[PDB]
């Protein structure tokens, strides 16, 4: 009713230790969401064209052309690691566990309170106003993860959070022929428009049922049950140079020290083994046959163009290129007492050794005369196309059937948790933004809107926008995310790497004297793992 609570606040993380080394992790997240009335109750089709920056020769990468439908609805996203875990629970997980499954997810909206502003300013209660809630359970509306724009709910249980205004990409065409500083022509910079065969205008009113929650109502999305693969919290270190049986050392060191090395007491052209170079007798560590290949090379900072413009080719694993950079604001980890619009940024350097070092590759003629001359080698220091800053490693692809690579690690707290699978015939082997991927169906999105509060002078035949009473809502959101983890076992004599607090990172976990908080990024895949 009007004076009865419809739910409870719960932000506890429960660890239930089943037998056989399996743990259930129930993460409860509760927030107070503050929502304003839409700027306009109409759907807009807006085109963004930053001609000012891309008309300059050399600024192709600064392209921001697109078309989007702007919607009067807002999205409530909780697809980020920081909504569910604090540094302590994250330490416990990444120090005690080895894998991680995604079991269940559920949401609720309760304790809705709608208010009206009257202009000093007076704030009255609208006991009869309503808040529209829509849940796209069938996954009809386009998927839109907020973690890529850093627009999820906040990371603090004691800080009120806002939802993000919903919008989606409308089709368009764009051609941007690249150039450089010193081009003699004006190649082409044209926004064509929309192909009528690809138009797609979605509305929440025509696709999903909308519930109207008043002050004493509550919404409860049932529990969604995932079915995915386990994310591993262990990293691998073995490259192709560390796979299999090492070579037998005929001369072992006698005086234990720092510069006393061992010696394989056999000439390189008199060794035994298998090679894939069928025209040479040398058996070394760079030439011996390994089972497969760990990682691959890919053209880095490469831009492929398509009907909607140029885009960067994504890299699976990096070692610079491949490492994701996260930028975020005061709601998502930045010091809440800083001033300015400069976001906090960090590059996540993963622990896994599955990248490449292009300054150390080379190609040589099949003759293999080992002391190699100039005309029989291609180094990462020779010009390709006459360009001093482009070598062959920039246009090199070594992805083949013998390539083995790992999935991306969780990024606390700004990384995404789950992702939807592409609705194509041939699916990608992994995503670079989320460790988990909903293959068949994924949790539905939760849109919120505040119902139109009309005045007494309303004319639908008036070209001007409707006059509404200034209304805003504050409700409470609750979420339950259930994981399954395995507890790790020690197989080595030596300890392993663990996450801990120390004198350097001490004040990143406690607030300042003025209430300033921050959530620094933590590594996830700490312990090593045997590959072969």
């Amino acid at each position, epitope marked *: 009713g009007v004076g009865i609570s419809t739910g409870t606040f719960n932000n506890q993380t429960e660890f239930k230790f089943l037998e056989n080394g399996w743990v259930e992790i129930t993460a409860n997240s509760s927030r107070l969401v503050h929502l304003n009335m839409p700027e306009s109750e109409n759907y807009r089709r807006v085109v963004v064209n930053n001609m*000012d920056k891309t*008309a300059v020769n050399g600024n192709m990468a600064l392209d921001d052309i697109h078309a989007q439908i702007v919607t009067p609805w807002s999205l409530v996203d909780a697809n980020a690691w920081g909504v569910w875990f604090n540094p302590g629970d994250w330490q416990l997980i990444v120090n005690t566990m080895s894998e991680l499954h995604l079991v269940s997810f559920e949401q609720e909206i309760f304790n809705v309170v709608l208010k009206t502003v009257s202009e000093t300013k007076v704030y009255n209660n609208d006991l009869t106003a309503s808040l529209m809630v829509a849940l796209d359970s069938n996954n009809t509306m386009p998927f839109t993860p907020a973690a890529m724009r850093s627009e999820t709910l906040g990371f603090y249980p004691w800080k009120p959070t806002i939802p993000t205004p919903w919008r989606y990409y409308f089709q368009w065409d764009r051609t941007l022929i690249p150039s450089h500083t010193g081009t003699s022509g004006t190649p082409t910079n044209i926004y064509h428009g929309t192909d009528p065969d690809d138009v797609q205008f979605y509305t929440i009113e025509n696709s999903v049922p909308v519930h109207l929650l008043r002050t004493g109502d509550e919404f409860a999305t049932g529990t969604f049950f995932f079915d995915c693969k386990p994310c591993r919290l262990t990293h691998t270190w073995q490259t192709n140079r560390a796979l299999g049986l090492p070579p037998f050392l005929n001369s072992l060191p006698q005086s234990e020290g720092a510069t006393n090395f061992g010696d394989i007491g056999v000439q390189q052209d008199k060794r035994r083994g298998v090679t894939q170079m069928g025209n040479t007798n040398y058996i070394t560590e760079a030439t011996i046959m390994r089972p497969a290949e760990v990682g691959y090379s890919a053209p880095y900072y490469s831009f492929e163009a398509s009907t909607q413009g140029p885009f960067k080719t994504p890299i699976a694993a990096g070692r610079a290129d491949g490492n994701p950079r996260y930028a975020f604001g005061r709601q998502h980890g930045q010091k809440t007492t800083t001033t300015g619009e400069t976001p906090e940024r960090f590059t996540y350097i993963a622990h896994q050794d599955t990248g490449r070092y292009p300054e150390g590759d080379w190609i040589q003629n099949i003759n293999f005369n080992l002391p190699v001359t100039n005309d029989n080698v291609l180094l990462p220091t020779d010009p390709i196309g006459g360009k001093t800053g482009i070598n062959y490693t920039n246009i090199f692809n070594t992805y083949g059937p013998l390539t083995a690579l790992n999935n991306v690690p969780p990024v606390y707290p700004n990384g995404q948790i789950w992702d939807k699978e592409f609705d194509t015939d041939l699916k990608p082997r992994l995503h670079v933004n989320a460790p988990f991927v909903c293959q068949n169906n994924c949790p539905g999105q939760l849109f919120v809107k505040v119902a139109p509060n009309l005045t007494n002078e309303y004319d639908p035949d008036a070209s001007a926008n409707m006059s509404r009473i200034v209304t805003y809502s504050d409700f409470w959101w609750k979420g339950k995310l259930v994981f399954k983890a395995k507890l790790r076992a020690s197989h080595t004599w030596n300890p392993i790497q663990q996450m801990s607090i120390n004198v350097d990172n001490q004040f990143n976990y406690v607030p300042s004297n003025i209430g300033g908080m921050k959530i620094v990024y933590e590594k996830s895949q700490l312990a090593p793992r045997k590959l072969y």
Partner: antibody
Amino acid sequence: AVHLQGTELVKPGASAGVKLSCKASGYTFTNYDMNWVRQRPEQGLEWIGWIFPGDGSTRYNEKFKGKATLTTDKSSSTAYQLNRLTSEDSAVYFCARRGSHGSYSFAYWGQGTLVTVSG
Amino acid sequence: DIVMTQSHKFMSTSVGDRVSITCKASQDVNTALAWYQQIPGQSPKLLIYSASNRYTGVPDRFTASGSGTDFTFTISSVQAEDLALYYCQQHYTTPWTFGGGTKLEIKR
């Protein structure tokens, strides 16, 4: 019909700053960055920086970093330079705009505003 | 920073001759070069961009060529309205740097 109109002479003392202005007419102001150049009678022309009025994005050179700050004003189509310390920086300042091509050539220049620092 | 040096500061010239101003760059700029003309006491006027292309409205007597570190800007037939201060700008990388200038004269 692109026209850039700068303010006229100024004579500040050797302690303060002066704000030079440049009014643009004849084009979408937010479609082109505004560049500021300097001409001393002995050291030649020199580029101070540029300001993109949409998004208000600046870039200077290392010489005029703490010496000049650029600012834009839409709804009036004006560009401003601040000239912080102005010790003996007496020269003619120009407000320039790219052109139609795409290279950072300067097709349209202002008439120039002279700044003399004395006592 | 790229320093751009024009060979001479004053170049003798008689009306009707062919004059060739030279410009050198500290490092290799591919084409990346613009040529300006300034009458003493006015604003510069853009003559050439990309070291070969002629801006709209420039008379066909001004041409330019070159690449890398050497560039040349030539007038095939001088007029009295062409004796000015010619500047050499590079638009290869920031900061944009100009040359010192070469004033064209009339022979004494």
